[PDB]
Design a protein around this nucleic acid. Structure first.
Ligand SMILES: [Zn+2]
Lengths: 120, 134, 49, 30, 61
RNA sequence: AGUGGAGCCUGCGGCUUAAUUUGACCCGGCCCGGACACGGACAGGAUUGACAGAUUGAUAGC
């Protein structure tokens, strides 16, 4: 696995001011604006859940309402459930979801399967 | 029994007193006479627009409304309408009516099933005590 | 002894309730109405349906 | 009684307010 | 007019939280607050590390 | 000059939906909701207010 030609271990060692040379434009604008209190709260919650877990076992899920959250490369391996307005969806953070928001992993609408039309 | 025949209905009161509760006569014998028990379910129309309302407290699931969709709803003040859609996950429903409903009003529908008598016939009947007022 | 009188006053209350409101049943919140009223149906007209 | 009727601490609260107002987004912690 | 049935539907609201009652807490007083107004009368409550005020909320170490 | 044909956009029906608000809606969660009478508790505190830390989706001294 590699992301812009960078291996994940270097990404784990990749400094915060120099990840602003590596993401897309929207992600870099967000991290230059900085994360608010709730996103760091989720970060600390995920770090606690990953740290306080058996090594052979997947970590315990963390439920959240945060969909504005951008996936940092620290989170790979954490097991996160995210609300879509009605139901939590349980998702594993993969290596290939560094450049993605959480909210696009829980779809907030159901696909349209058209029924027979009424009187129009 | 072939009519004409008198009919008396008594109740076992207490300590052997048969209290006469009812009287009449025997009409024609048939098990073809349908007896229909009615249940009337009532709900409160709490969002009233013109000729359409949103009603609650009458069902409590989403598919409860879908099961009893084909039944016509009526109204305590004489209106007549029907269910369109359930909106909430709970039993909230959209109902279209003939005229505009009052906020004071009540929606209700009737459900029907044929009820049959219980086989509980026994020819033995206790001898009464002599009767007296209570 | 008093349980018979309790059912007596209950029957009094049920009789007074089924003349103010002739056949009204509060739908149960715990049992689904399609199951508790499973054998029931709606007639368009009690005369002609 | 009815008809006859008619600093350092503020600076500490100020700096606590400024700390919390900077703490809604810190942008630095890793 | 036409009257409504008034459904019952009992829902138990009895289990509501009440804060714990400390009985005769005047035993443990006998730090004094050197404040502008609440001096010489008010006792100055103890944590595990630091004592906090119950009237003016001053900050110490 | 066009529109009606075409791609896109918007409106109204219709269709899906938990909701697709309407000529504000949906999914969860904390809080409390009268007087008066009766029965308890209260000065051997009724109850308010409260800095820090832990909570659940929320910096909930509710
Ligand atoms: Zn204080």
């Amino acid at each position: 696995f590699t992301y812009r030609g960078v291996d994940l271990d270097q990404l784990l060692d990749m400094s915060y001011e120099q990840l602003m040379q590596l993401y897309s434009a929207r992600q870099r604008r967000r991290l230059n604006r900085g994360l608010r209190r709730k996103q760091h709260s989720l970060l600390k919650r995920l770090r606690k859940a990953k740290k306080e877990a058996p090594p052979m076992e997947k970590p315990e899920v963390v439920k959240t309402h945060l969909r504005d959250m951008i996936i940092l490369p620290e989170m790979v391996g954490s097991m996160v459930g995210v609300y879509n307005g009605k139901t939590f969806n349980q998702v594993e953070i993969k290596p290939e979801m560094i450049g993605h928001y959480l909210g696009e992993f829980s779809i907030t609408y159901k696909p349209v399967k058209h029924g027979r039309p009424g009187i129009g | 029994t072939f009519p004409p025949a008198s009919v008396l209905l008594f109740k076992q009161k207490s300590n052997g007193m048969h209290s006469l509760i009812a009287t009449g006569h025997l009409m024609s014998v048939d098990p073809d006479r349908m007896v229909i028990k009615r249940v009337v379910l009532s709900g409160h129309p709490f969002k009233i627009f013109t000729k359409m309302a949103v009603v609650r407290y009458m069902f409590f699931n989403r598919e409860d409304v879908l099961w009893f969709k084909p039944v016509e709803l009526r109204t305590k003040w004489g209106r007549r309408g029907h269910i369109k859609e359930p909106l909430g996950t709970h039993g909230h429903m959209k109902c279209s009516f003939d005229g505009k409903l009052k906020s004071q009003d009540t929606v209700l529908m009737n459900l029907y099933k044929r009820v049959f008598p219980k086989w509980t016939y026994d020819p033995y009947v206790p001898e009464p005590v002599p009767w007296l007022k209570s | 002894d008093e349980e018979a009188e309790a059912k007596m006053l209950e029957k009094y209350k049920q009789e007074r309730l089924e003349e103010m409101f002739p056949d009204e049943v509060d739908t149960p919140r715990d049992v689904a109405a399609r199951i508790r009223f499973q054998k029931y149906r709606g007639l368009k007209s009690f005369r002609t349906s | 009684k009815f008809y006859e009727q008619y600093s350092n601490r503020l600076q500490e609260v100020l700096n606590d307010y400024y700390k919390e107002k900077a703490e809604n987004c810190v942008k630095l912690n890793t | 007019a036409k009257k409504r049935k008034k459904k019952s539907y009992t829902t138990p609201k009895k289990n509501k939280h009440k804060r714990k009652k400390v009985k005769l807490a005047v035993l443990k007083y006998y730090r004094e607050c050197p404040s502008d107004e609440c001096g010489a009368g008010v006792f100055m409550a103890s944590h595990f590390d630091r004592h906090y005020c119950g009237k003016c909320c001053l900050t110490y170490c």
